């Protein structure tokens, strides 16, 4: 039955981190009295922890923004290839944003080129699509939410080669259509482009804020 | 105002993991942008990252078990110093309401 106790606290650790917050410590032992033949167990903790503050901001790596708008599907130093069997190219750009304090630069290609046809302002024959899937009830949480589905005059895309094989290094290109065409179709309900319909959503639940719900 | 400083933001559940401790400002805790902060144990853990919308939650159960109803899901802007997409302060939410059908008749 010997009552043990704490010894001297050791040297404090330096602040580990060079930015932000960190945690330091001191170590003590139960070595001077020592519980012998039973007793207690020194009463407490053999370790204290403390927050150290360097007051200097930390690196943040840059992230990619969303891709820009596609360039026009024309040829450099020529004219245009609209309404024609001519595969062209177009480019797109990204922007690295948010890089501060010697952070890592954005990884990847900042440009994107893909091959294309041009149906910009091209008169194309059309056919009405079927009814689209019912949209979201808008406005959510507002007075009287309503859905919306629609039929639109879908253009008949011309039967062009979707795969064009160039030479040089024998590179074959997945070619996709670009542009806003002018779809021609017969009127449905007094409208030429898009005819929609709305229906109210039934048994609308009230919106309760999750921070207001937990409390 | 001082705040509790946590070392990790879970993001899958929005909880504050790994308590570095308290008695420290929000500016000094959010120098490391991988950290997170909350006031006491009440909740709302905000990461020290630049503000960005979280993941859309799972769809709520449909308001009726019969015919056409309506269901909600939320998304909370989490972050510090800045705004989310749409002039949204950190803490505000956005909802999507969809028509559901547990049983069609």
């Amino acid at each position, epitope marked *: 039955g010997v009552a043990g106790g704490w010894g001297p606290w050791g040297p404090v650790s330096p602040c*580990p981190v060079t930015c932000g917050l960190g945690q330091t410590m001191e170590q003590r032992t139960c070595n001077h009295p020592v519980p012998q033949h039973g007793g207690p167990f020194c009463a407490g903790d*053999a370790t204290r*922890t403390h927050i150290c503050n360097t007051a200097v901001p930390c690196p943040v790596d840059g992230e990619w923004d969303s891709w820009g708008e596609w360039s026009p599907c024309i040829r450099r130093n020529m004219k245009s290839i609209s309404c024609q069997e001519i595969p062209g190219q177009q480019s797109r750009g990204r922007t690295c944003r948010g890089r501060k304090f010697d952070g890592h630069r954005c990884a990847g290609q900042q440009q994107d080129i893909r091959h294309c046809y041009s149906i910009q302002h091209c008169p194309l024959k059309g056919s009405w699509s079927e009814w689209s899937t019912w949209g979201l009830c808008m406005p959510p949480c507002g007075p009287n939410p309503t859905r919306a589905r629609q039929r639109l005059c879908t253009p008949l895309l011309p039967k062009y080669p979707p795969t064009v094989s160039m030479v040089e290094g024998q590179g074959e290109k997945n070619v996709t259509f670009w542009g806003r065409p002018l779809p021609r179709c017969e009127e449905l309900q007094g409208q030429k482009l898009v005819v929609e319909e709305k229906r109210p959503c039934l048994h609308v639940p009230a919106c309760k804020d999750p921070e207001e719900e937990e409390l | 105002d001082p705040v509790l400083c946590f070392t990790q933001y879970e993001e899958s559940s929005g909880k504050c993991k790994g308590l570095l401790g308290g008695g420290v400002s929000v500016e000094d805790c959010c120098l490391n942008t991988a950290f997170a902060y909350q006031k006491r144990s009440g909740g709302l853990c905000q990461p020290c990252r630049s503000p960005r919308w979280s993941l859309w939650s799972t769809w709520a159960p449909c308001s009726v078990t019969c015919s056409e109803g309506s269901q909600l899901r939320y998304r909370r802007c989490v972050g510090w110093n800045g705004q989310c997409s749409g002039k949204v302060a950190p803490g505000t939410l956005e909802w999507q309401l969809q028509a559901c059908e547990d049983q069609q008749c």
Partner: nanobody
Amino acid sequence: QVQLVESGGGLVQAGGSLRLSCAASERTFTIYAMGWFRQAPGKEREFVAAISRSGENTDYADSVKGRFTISRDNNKNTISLQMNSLKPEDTAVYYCAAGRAILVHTTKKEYDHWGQGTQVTVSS
């Protein structure tokens, strides 16, 4: 930055005991969380045991739990691995590892400083 020197390996009979020790750099000792790894013949390096900067928090692999014990002496800049009930599958080069830890009770499994190793061979 920090240098690590292992000692205590050798040839042990099966069922016997061996105590390894790892000496680290003196001025930066309490900054790094530390641990033990091993690499058997023909196998990848595997985690054995970890200890925090405190010496109060420990973590062990399932293959060595109950047989091995990791300890830390913050007076003498050493850690130790007391290996009991040794089996021929414990034959490996045992490595001491050091890693920067923000919290003093955190045990790590990822480490960026490694010693040269000590050879432990267990004969049946």
